[model samples]
Target: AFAHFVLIHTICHGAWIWHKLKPLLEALGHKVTALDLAASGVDPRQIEEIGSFDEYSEPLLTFLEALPPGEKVILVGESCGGLNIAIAADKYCEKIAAAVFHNSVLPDTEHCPSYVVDKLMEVFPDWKDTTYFTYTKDGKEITGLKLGFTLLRENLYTLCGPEEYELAKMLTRKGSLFQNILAKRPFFTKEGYGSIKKIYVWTDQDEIFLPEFQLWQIENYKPDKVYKVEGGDHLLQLTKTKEIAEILQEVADTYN
Candidate 1:
């Protein structure tokens, strides 16, 4: 049997991140579509225009809204992309066959655990530094936040090699500061998003989202199924493509 899978990228990344995995998933007899949130990928939207979380997420919402009726997709979210999936499942639960959080943050209701935020702050220290934001002559903010190679290596891809890191660097873009900081807490209920199947892929070696914190999220959110990848970092799709594809296939078999 075949299933439709939608891959969602994390902050500072676009649909390009799934380049390696998309083909593999296709070869495994699944239809795959990776998305670029507004202003993130090749969308060419200005940063200042994406001032709020809703505006930044408009692209994804548009995609989900455009899906044909009676067509359900397996939504896989990475990193902060988890929030996007949660929102999708909430509003378009019927369209989502299943929701998977891959080394991603799982917010409880609307707010995530305090430790999660603390760990993020630890990784970036200052959001301005990681994003490469610049101050105007009048000390006003300009140039959206963009993740640097050092931050990506330290928090996102410690386990990946130089070649992979370079590719990631070349494709990476600036993320929205407001979107990153503004908390769009989960608002799903048992009758809506909660009714759909939920899965979590735990990356044990992740630095940005620590194992303990991941465990905390699992305990709090309580997904229907959980998968673990030992020694897998945050970017497991890049580092552990085969393993991820296999897990995704298993989920499809179980649910779809």
Candidate 2:
């Protein structure tokens, strides 16, 4: 079977998150599918229907069902995408080759992404919940979540340079409370990440999952490979795509 890299995008980002990295990986003889989570990424159909955590996860689970038997993939999930991957992995362990939590939170066995967010809100008491409707995604404008500049600057733009930061503003166009709810809920089964080979890609200067925080997760997970990127930030997959692809390819070479 052919090799595959299944990319799960963060809250606001669409499949475009992997736009730069896809070709690089493909050139090395692999297929990449950067999927949009429900209620995000221009999935017009999922808009009104995305009410609960389980509802949003159905599409991802369906994709898992579609995988060819005996096909194993490298699953890469970012931010809330981490919860998606964790849920998928625990449910369909045999389909995944390994996982890379890209500067993301751990999917606790019981909590999904939102549960984590609730805690984060508590930790950062200064964050105000201001929900603005993003008109660009669906015909409807939704609200009730906070996409604070402080959050991005402190967490997402930690390592990002001026140019990278601007690009994030331009490209990252939407955030979903519905999706965050899914993330807050835990996705892992009892099996959790037990046997899956994992790799944690910690940006030396990540803002969202701070360098120290990412390192803490890595130490906790004990992934098969631990890589650091210099001049690498949260959007390195989009900015420093070549280098990121090279690192992942190297992992494929070693593991596959």
Candidate 3:
């Protein structure tokens, strides 16, 4: 059976980042769905209006809920998006065939929802030109962050093409760490989240996430498969587009 792929991007990034790989998967006759999280990409919801991580992940949750009967989607998340798919899988595990993490923060069932993000800052603290700010949502205060072009280029876009980097500079938006907000949420469940196949695709040269952090995540919680993309930067979909497309095809064929 041809797989249905639902791609989730990292913080401050949108569905646009998948532009390179989306068509490659489609060219192989697979279905791909990529969408912007709230306030990211071209999504209209400003970070100020979003109160919780669940609210930020609403678009994905809604999509899974609306899927037709007997259909399952392979949720592929990159960077901080691992948490987004984890949240979605928690709610709709049966609808998910697998969850793929592309150098993303993998949330474990043994800790709070914010554990990964908390460790992310500890391991890789400096944001270069990126800015973090606090804002009011209804009656409460929430923090959101945005990545400047310098940080994007020197770090995330290190191995990516100039055109993709240029497109990111135009499309990137402000998003949240959601650490405090996610702390109040529940951890992943064994019956729901742990049951789904977890696949991790990573590179050794990630500047922002750090090599140690990616390795730590692997040992922190193992996946069904850990496919490595050598010498690639943070944006593997851009830097290693065709290779990653083939990997997704492999995952698609092997899992379903």
In candidate 3, which residue pairs get closer than 3 Å at backbone N, Cα or C atoms, i.e. clash?
A: none
lDDT per prediction? 0.75, 0.65, 0.88
lDDT of 3 by residue, 1-256 (tens): 5899999988788899898889988998999999888888888888888888888999999999999978999999999999998888889999998889999999999999898888888888888998889998756678878887899999989978788888988888888877887898888898888899999999888998898888988998888899999888998888888889888889988886
Per-residue lDDT over 192-255 for candidate 2, one digit per residue giving the tens place of the 0 to 100 score: 5566777767676654555555655555445677778777677678657787787778777665
Model 1 deviation from native, Cα RMSD in Å: 3.8
Query: Cα RMSD to native, each candidate?
Result: 3.8, 4.8, 1.1
TM-score of each: 0.86, 0.76, 0.97
How far does residue 17 in candidate 2 sit from its true spot (Å)? 1.5
After TM-score superposition, the amount by which residue 212's alpha carbon in candidate 2 deviates from its true location, in angstroms, is 3.4
Cα error of candidate 3 at position 102, Å: 0.6
Best by TM-score: 3
Model 3 stretches astray by more than 4 angstroms: none
lDDT of 1 by residue, 1-256 (tens): 6888999987678898898899999999999988888778787885655655455677777888999999888999988877677666667888888888898877555453233444555553643337456433223344467786787877777888888888778988777544334444334455666678889997778876776778877877788999999776888998899999999999889886
Q: How many backbone clashes does candidate 2 have?
A: 16
Ranking by TM-score: 3, 1, 2
Q: Which pairs of residues have clashing backbones in candidate 1?
A: 109-186, 110-185, 110-186, 131-146
Instruction: Give the Å shift of residue 30 in candidate 2.
Output: 1.4
Clashes of each: 4, 16, 0
